[PDB]
Design an enzyme around this catalytic site. Structure first.
Site, PDB file in Angstrom:
ATOM      1  N   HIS A  60      22.667  94.353  57.491  1.00 52.47           N
ATOM      2  CA  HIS A  60      23.202  95.702  57.756  1.00 52.47           C
ATOM      3  C   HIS A  60      23.168  96.034  59.271  1.00 52.47           C
ATOM      4  CE1 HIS A  60      19.174  97.539  58.353  1.00 52.47           C
ATOM      5  NE2 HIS A  60      18.813  96.529  57.581  1.00 52.47           N
ATOM      6  N   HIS A  90      16.839  98.507  68.101  1.00 55.11           N
ATOM      7  CA  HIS A  90      18.060  98.233  67.350  1.00 55.11           C
ATOM      8  C   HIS A  90      19.016  99.411  67.527  1.00 55.11           C
ATOM      9  CE1 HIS A  90      15.796 100.486  64.085  1.00 55.11           C
ATOM     10  NE2 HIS A  90      16.934 101.155  64.127  1.00 55.11           N
ATOM     11  N   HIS A  92      22.403 101.944  65.826  1.00 62.37           N
ATOM     12  CA  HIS A  92      23.259 102.371  64.731  1.00 62.37           C
ATOM     13  C   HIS A  92      24.605 102.653  65.312  1.00 62.37           C
ATOM     14  CE1 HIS A  92      19.892 102.929  61.896  1.00 62.37           C
ATOM     15  NE2 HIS A  92      19.221 103.180  63.006  1.00 62.37           N
ATOM     16  N   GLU A 102      23.240 108.803  64.784  1.00 60.70           N
ATOM     17  CA  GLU A 102      22.649 109.346  63.588  1.00 60.70           C
ATOM     18  C   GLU A 102      22.271 110.775  63.845  1.00 60.70           C
ATOM     19  OE1 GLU A 102      19.833 106.165  62.310  1.00 60.70           O
ATOM     20  OE2 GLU A 102      21.242 105.997  60.633  1.00 60.70           O
ATOM     21  N   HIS A 115      17.683 103.051  68.780  1.00 63.02           N
ATOM     22  CA  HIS A 115      16.306 103.349  68.384  1.00 63.02           C
ATOM     23  C   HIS A 115      15.339 102.341  68.960  1.00 63.02           C
ATOM     24  CE1 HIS A 115      18.043 105.527  64.653  1.00 63.02           C
ATOM     25  NE2 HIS A 115      18.060 106.306  65.719  1.00 63.02           N
ATOM     26  N   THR A 195      15.389 105.940  59.102  1.00 66.29           N
ATOM     27  CA  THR A 195      16.705 106.439  58.698  1.00 66.29           C
ATOM     28  C   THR A 195      17.425 105.561  57.683  1.00 66.29           C
ATOM     29  OG1 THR A 195      17.992 105.509  60.529  1.00 66.29           O
ATOM     30  CG2 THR A 195      16.816 107.628  60.962  1.00 66.29           C
TER      31      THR A 195
HETATM   32 ZN   LIG Z   1      17.260 102.972  63.448  1.00 68.59          ZN
END
Ligand SMILES: [Zn+2]
Length: 256
Positions: A60, A90, A92, A102, A115, A195
């Protein structure tokens, strides 16, 4: 679990009831409703390029993991009296440039989010133990605003060639993630969650006021990553961002 309709954020309730909890993340930060906290100290990071360990395609997303055996890379200050140990960074991103972040600020969605994750080595002896604890994790969120290519991202994106499909991992070495952080470390903080599953309410979020840049093509590089195993039909990682969740009476403090 994943990010499809079948198995996505609205489905996570089924297997992770905590998805409907009171300390869920991300949140929309309304700047007129934040309270300036005078007790908040500067955010201080001191990371050691030598702790950078590996990069991994997790189906993912992709993770850049750090050696977390000792205190060569630490976060402190802000809301903390405990020093927190670096273990991962990492991103998003979203299927389009319009929304990818996010966290949101006064309803403005950004193009992606970084993050940077730490665990409480002052209180616990492993990430595994800290992961489920209310004071366990501390995560810096940095909003990523589409515009100019961010050369600081270079080594990262350069690395993704070697982890194209799910389960591929590669050494990732001699890197200090603080070079990805914005100039000003003015921040908001609130008590929140991971998250995605397992979605533990163990995160003190440090959300930077200042964003960093990313080009539209750099984002396309994220989305080029493949969620399938080597040999299967290609399924690119088009998105991995969770919608913002209800505040449930929580307060977001501002350092500035
Ligand atoms: Zn994250």
């Amino acid at each position: 679990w994943g990010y499809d309709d079948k198995n996505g954020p609205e489905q996570w309730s089924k297997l992770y009831p905590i998805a409907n909890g009171n300390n869920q993340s991300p949140v929309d930060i309304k700047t007129s409703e934040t309270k300036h906290d005078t007790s908040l100290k500067p955010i201080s990071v001191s990371y050691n390029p030598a702790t950078a360990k590996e990069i991994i395609n997790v189906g993912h997303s992709f993770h850049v993991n750090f050696e977390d055996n000792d205190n060569r890379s630490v976060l402190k200050g802000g809301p903390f009296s405990d020093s927190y140990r670096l273990f991962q960074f990492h991103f998003h991103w979203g299927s389009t440039n319009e929304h990818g972040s996010e966290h949101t600020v006064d309803g403005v969605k950004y193009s992606a989010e970084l993050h940077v994750a730490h665990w409480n080595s002052a209180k616990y002896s492993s990430l595994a133990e800290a992961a489920s604890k209310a004071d366990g994790l501390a995560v810096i969120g940095v909003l990523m605003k589409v515009g100019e290519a961010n050369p600081k991202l270079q080594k990262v994106l350069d690395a993704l060639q070697a982890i194209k499909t799910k389960g591929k991992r590669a050494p990732f070495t001699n890197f200090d993630p603080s070079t990805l952080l914005p100039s000003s470390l003015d921040f908001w903080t609130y008590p929140g969650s991971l998250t995605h599953p397992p979605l533990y309410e163990s995160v003190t979020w440090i959300i930077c006021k200042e964003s960093i840049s990313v080009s539209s093509e750099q984002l396309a590089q994220f989305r080029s990553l493949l969620s399938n195993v080597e040999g299967d039909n290609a399924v690119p990682m088009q998105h991995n961002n969770r919608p913002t969740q209800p505040l449930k009476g929580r307060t977001v403090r501002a350092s500035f």
